[PDB]
Design a protein around this ligand. Structure first.
Ligand SMILES: O=C(O)C1=C[C@H](O)[C@@H](O)[C@H]([C@H](O)[C@H](O)CO)O1
Ligand SMILES: [Ca+2]
Length: 384
């Protein structure tokens, strides 16, 4: 791997700063956020980087009033290299007191398609949760009002503005579902031109051409709720999903035309039942798939980025622990993540972090860290 010959490079700093932090991120309106969770990042075809998150208004919980927030790099060629290269916090959508979340962007020329999940503010996944005003949530159910919805918003100006989100639940989520999720993290564009967005139990597939996409569902037997997808060097698709119980990632492989294998636990990728991220880094010699998750069956604090050279991404290297380049003052790093390839040939990653001030409770402030590193930083890691 010639990338090992470069001097290792890494930078890391908090990008979404929770309410307890000195430069806590707020919207221009004055609306702030207790916590930021559920990152997604894409480099656009201009080289600008768009970073999305759930702005969790009042506490760190998955329900209640949650707005879909974002930042862009100030220019198209700074690659987010320093804190000063990032714009102030903006909002894609925050309408109502429900939950706008699960950012799952895909770039198509140019157009950025951002798929989102939504639920009414009176509902939560489990039900029975107490909101700040004292009302108790109902459990997400199969009704139009009480189910999880699937929305699409689009930007055609490099993330500067976003269309009114379009509810595509009846089109792209099976009838009779209650819970749902898209991503979170990112969708992909195949070498053959289709868009593929990972979702619970399915891929959302955009056929057609740029400027004229048509969406449908590919149902996947045994897939996770929170999936990742990429194209492997053999030209097939690869789903690498969060398992229903802690242990290992679950993986399936397939094509749009012929469908997917069963999902099976990947004993080489321990996972604590948490979201992960995957990235097709490059397509010529040597082709590389990058994977990032917490490499542990019981903790989110063992973040590990890895490379596979396999045509089917069967096996990964040890890779490198993100704790080798730790951040101070932004909490205990580990959780959900998202990766993109920057225009200056770095892996750009967003990673959740938890101040843990309230332990596992709802008052623990959650931030999101931005990292850039080159392949050399991974490859020259001590146990790699
Ligand atoms: O931090 C989490 O574990 C988490 C955060 C998300 O906001 C939830 O939508 C998601 C969901 O609860 C699980 O995928 C089980 O469906 O889990
Ligand atoms: Ca709101």
């Amino acid at each position: 791997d010639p990338a090992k010959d470069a001097t290792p490079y890494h930078v890391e700093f908090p990008l979404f700063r929770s309410a307890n932090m000195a430069s806590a991120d707020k919207l221009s309106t004055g609306v702030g956020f207790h916590s930021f969770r559920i990152p997604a990042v894409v480099r656009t075809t201009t080289g600008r980087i768009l970073a999305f998150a759930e702005g969790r208004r009042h506490d760190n919980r998955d329900f209640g009033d949650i707005n879909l927030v974002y930042k862009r790099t100030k220019t198209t060629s700074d690659n987010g290299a320093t804190l000063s290269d990032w714009e102030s916090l903006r909002e894609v959508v925050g309408s109502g007191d429900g939950t706008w979340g699960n950012p799952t962007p895909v770039v198509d020329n140019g157009t950025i398609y951002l798929f989102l999940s939504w639920n009414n503010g009176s509902y939560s996944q489990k039900g029975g949760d107490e909101l700040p005003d004292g009302t108790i949530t109902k459990k997400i159910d199969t009704t139009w009002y009480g189910r999880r919805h699937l929305y699409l918003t689009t930007s055609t100006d490099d993330g500067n503005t976003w269309s009114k989100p379009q509810d595509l639940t009846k089109e792209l989520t099976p009838d009779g579902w209650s819970w749902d999720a898209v991503g979170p993290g990112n969708g992909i564009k195949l070498s053959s031109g289709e868009l593929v967005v990972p979702a619970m139990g399915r891929n959302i597939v955009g056929r057609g051409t740029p400027g004229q996409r048509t969406w449908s569902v590919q149902r996947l037997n045994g897939a996770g709720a929170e999936g990742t997808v990429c194209e492997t060097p053999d030209g097939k698709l690869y789903r690498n999903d969060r398992p229903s119980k802690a242990g290992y990632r679950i993986v399936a492989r397939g094509t749009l035309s012929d469908g997917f294998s069963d999902f099976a636990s990947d004993s080489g990728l321990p996972d604590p039942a948490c979201q992960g991220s995957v990235l097709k880094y490059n397509t010529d010699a040597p082709p590389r798939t990058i994977f990032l998750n917490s490499a542990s069956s019981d903790s989110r604090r063992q973040m590990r980025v890895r490379i596979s050279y396999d045509a089917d991404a069967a096996k990964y290297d040890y890779g490198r622990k993100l704790a080798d380049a730790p951040v101070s003052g932004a909490g205990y790093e580990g959780g959900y993540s998202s990766m993109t390839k920057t225009a200056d040939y770095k892996i750009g990653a967003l990673v959740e972090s938890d101040f843990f001030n309230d332990g596992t409770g709802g008052g623990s402030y959650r931030s999101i860290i931005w990292r850039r590193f080159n392949l050399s930083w991974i490859l020259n890691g001590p146990n790699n």
